[PDB]
Amino acid sequence: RDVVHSTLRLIIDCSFDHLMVLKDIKKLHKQIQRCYAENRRALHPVQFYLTSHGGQLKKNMDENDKGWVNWKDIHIKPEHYSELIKKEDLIYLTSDSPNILKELDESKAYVIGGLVDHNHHKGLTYKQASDYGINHAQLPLGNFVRKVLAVNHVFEIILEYLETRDWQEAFFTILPQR
Ligand SMILES: Nc1ncnc2c1ncn2[C@@H]1O[C@H](CSCC[C@H](N)C(=O)O)[C@@H](O)[C@H]1O
Numbered sequence: 001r002d003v004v005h006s007t008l009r010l011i012i013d014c015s016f017d018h019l020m021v022l023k024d025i026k027k028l029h030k031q032i033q034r035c036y037a038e039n040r041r042a043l044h045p046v047q048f049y050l051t052s053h054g055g056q057l058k059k060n061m062d063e064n065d066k067g068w069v070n071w072k073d074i075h076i077k078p079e080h081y082s083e084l085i086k087k088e089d090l091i092y093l094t095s096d097s098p099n100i101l102k103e104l105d106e107s108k109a110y111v112i113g114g115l116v117d118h119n120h121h122k123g124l125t126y127k128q129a130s131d132y133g134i135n136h137a138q139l140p141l142g143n144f145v146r147k148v149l150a151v152n153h154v155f156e157i158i159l160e161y162l163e164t165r166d167w168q169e170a171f172f173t174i175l176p177q178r
Contacts (some may be wrong), residue, residue, distance in 0.1 A: 004019050006046050008106040010158055011111045012048075013112065020056070035151070045159070050076045052077075052079070081111060092134055095147050097129070100138060113125040116150075119146055152156050
């Protein structure tokens, strides 16, 4: 299939490894596998990044997904996203940001926190983004939906919005119902 990739850079910031138990690391690994499989099947796949790759996640990936070094159309880097992407290009996605995302800028790099929180580290990614001086925004969930979404849910919404250009349709397709 002749696939037209989106210029949008989508980074899973894996610098929170030490804040998760091995059980939550395995859950993050499972969510990353879902992001990879959905990106490879997307109409307009993003430039997928896995930054700060190390610790428990790297060892769990070395043990179960031995072929992660062979993985195609993914940037798996041990460096922090700050070391690889320009400060002005970054937008950290976080539910605690007061900024409401209206449109996606395909020239920017959007960051998703590689964290299975369980509502324990409330406002952590928003605090780290504000301290570093980088831009931050929340998904326009409004009245459709804790508004905290899983790593793969945020990633899949970005892919669905690049296809539909309708936020309401993107949340409806990806988010699980009660
Ligand atoms: N409503 C929302 N809008 C934007 N990004 C969101 C979101 N809900 C979750 N995310 C993203 O999904 C990631 C995993 S959820 C972890 C939440 C954690 N308490 C935090 O401080 O972010 C988050 O780090 C964030 O990047």
